[PDB]
């Protein structure tokens with residue numbers, strides 16, 4: 147029993163974090179085999195951030211311009227290349243702590259753990275979702291760029307996020323591990339803004355199932371609804387449209403609790419129309435949307451990693 | 453910017469988790485140097501749980517009755533002893549991954565990270581507080597006992613919790629790493645209940661300071677209050693009394709934001725008396741009480757560990 151915003155164990159990723167210094171700029175890097183991945187704006191100076199041409203900035207650098215430190219050990223850079231907005235520093239030593247891993251670009255709505263890091267040293271771990279507007283609501287200070295987001299499946303670390311910048315509303319923007327930003331953002335310090343966000347409907351529904359699995363039924367009702375009539379109310383409350391795909395994904399949770407997906411939708415509709423009336427669900431007074439259907443099954447059933 | 457319920461990086465503790473099997477009972481253990489710590493009820497059978505005498509149960513066991521597995525490696529038990537409600541299995545191999553560590557018994561109100569584990573394999577990490585009634589609101593399934601709670605200071609892991617049982621309200625009870633339960637609970641399956649809980653006042657105040665550090669001021673007011681007049685309203689809303697000690701602890705946060713502690717108390721009083729009126733604080737529609745003053749400073753300033 148109980149339900150918490152749970153992150154994956156972070157040890158496999160802690161063994162990969164390093165410090166990268168070039169010029170006056172220091173940030174975090176990810177050391178896998180003999181390559182260190184980090185944000186390309188590490189080559190920018192205090193006047194290079196307004197509108198840089200990174201190809202032209204990179205051709206002017208030598209390998210010895212990059213200081214890479216793993217613990218109290220200098221790593222030696224023997225090559226470099228730019229891929230999109232990430233820089234790849236080839237070093238002469240393979241990381242002995244390299245886990246099994248993949249690079250994956252996730253869809254909005256999916257969740258991951260963030261290992262926040264400063265100067266190559268892990269600071270803390272928390273769970274995030276990619277919002278529909280391709281920002282993440284993180285917790286990041288100066289010097290956190292290069293920290294990564296990840297999922298773990300059995301023994302394999304699927305890296306999905308590298309942190310780059312903060313936007314004026316206090317939300318955060320970054321790339322996949324191949325240097326492609328999530329969303330329309332670019333790595334220069336010109337005016338950019340998040341864009342309007344929406345609530346991740348399928349996730350709110352998964353979390354209502356988590357509540358039922360854990361003992362709450364107070365929000366259920368005897369009604370049902372059709373997908374279209376649901377989506378009509380969802381649109382009004384700035385919720386994402388629920389697709390037939392989302393319905394099928396909620397299949398296992400529906401079958402374990404015996405509440406049909408559209409019946410749970412009728413419950414959400416009533417919660418949206420009437421509020422929660424001073425009641426809470428799983429310790430929350432808001433409809434929570436940063437648990438996927440997979441997250442709920444994982445935590446309400448006990449899946450481990452090795 | 454941003455504020456998240458952040459756990460400590462869990463790698464140092466993942467390297468210590470093991471599986472302990474005796475009879476038909478399997479749970480998690482903590483391997484530090486050449487000792488494995490685990491809950492003593494691992495020696496209980498399906499009819500030993502009603503009212504066991506553990507001393508009498510333990511004298512009847514031999515070393516070879518205990519199967520300890522670290523990864524795919526059998527560890528050999530060469531001795532055993534009971535300390536309060538924890539069993540200490542001396543094994544012939546020191547754990548090479550033993551971090552620097554301490555065993556500490558924490559006060560109600562303090563927070564820690566929990567590495568939830570099944571069969572010696574980490575499942576996830578989340579942040580918890582010791583509630584005033586000496587339970588924790590965890591996320592735990594069958595087979596999670598022996599999972600530990602911890603804090604990290606620089607390089608040192610301060611272990612403070614080992615999980616033992618769930619209580620009928622869905623909250624959780626366990627011991628410090630020397631086998632002493634938090635609260636009045638005992639490790640047998642007779643009727644026990646949590647006892648009424650209260651809100652951790654000093655922590656709610658620390659979290660209001662986190663909100664101000666991060667940009668919100670909407671809940672502030674021009675009023676002040678005295679400690680006694682505050683505590684008079686706090687008592688009505690089932691809040692813990694705020695002591696002069698709590699006031700001093702909130703000193704750094706008060707000085708960094710320029711809001712006197714008693715002025716922030718006057719703000720909390722108004723929030724308690726009037727509710728939040730459909731507004732949120734740091735993404736929450738409830739007054740959050742599982743961040744200590746230390747937690748806020750750590751996350752709003754960037755303290756790392758190595």
Ligand SMILES: *CC(=O)[C@H](C[C@@H]1CCNC1=O)NC(=O)[C@H](CC1CCCCC1)NC(=O)[C@@H](NC(=O)OCc1ccccc1)[C@@H](C)OC(C)(C)C
Pocket residue numbers: 173187190195286287288289290291292309310311312313314318332333334335336337338339453
């Ligand atoms: C890499 C890092 O460690 C930091 C981490 C951020 C600082 C505070 N929280 C963070 O997540 N990243 C930066 O400071 C980053 C620097 C690079 C250098 C140039 C190429 C990309 C950014 N800058 C920002 O995050 C910056 N955001 C920003 O400029 O957004 C575009 C913009 C510009 C003007 C108006 C609107 C939008 C931050 C520091 O600036 C604000 C004011 C948005 C917080």
Ligand SMILES: *CC(=O)[C@H](C[C@@H]1CCNC1=O)NC(=O)[C@H](CC1CCCCC1)NC(=O)[C@@H](NC(=O)OCc1ccccc1)[C@@H](C)OC(C)(C)C
Pocket residue numbers: 147479493496501592593594595596597598615616617618619620624638639640641642643644645
């Ligand atoms: C060690 C474990 O892996 C599990 C973990 C719990 C199971 C579900 N969530 C958990 O945190 N621990 C137990 O199952 C534990 C077994 C030991 C064996 C005897 C010595 C101490 C307990 N049992 C419980 O947690 C049990 N709680 C319980 O008996 O509380 C006392 C009580 C008895 C009767 C009435 C009221 C209170 C759970 C499994 O039983 C309830 C119904 C309270 C969930």
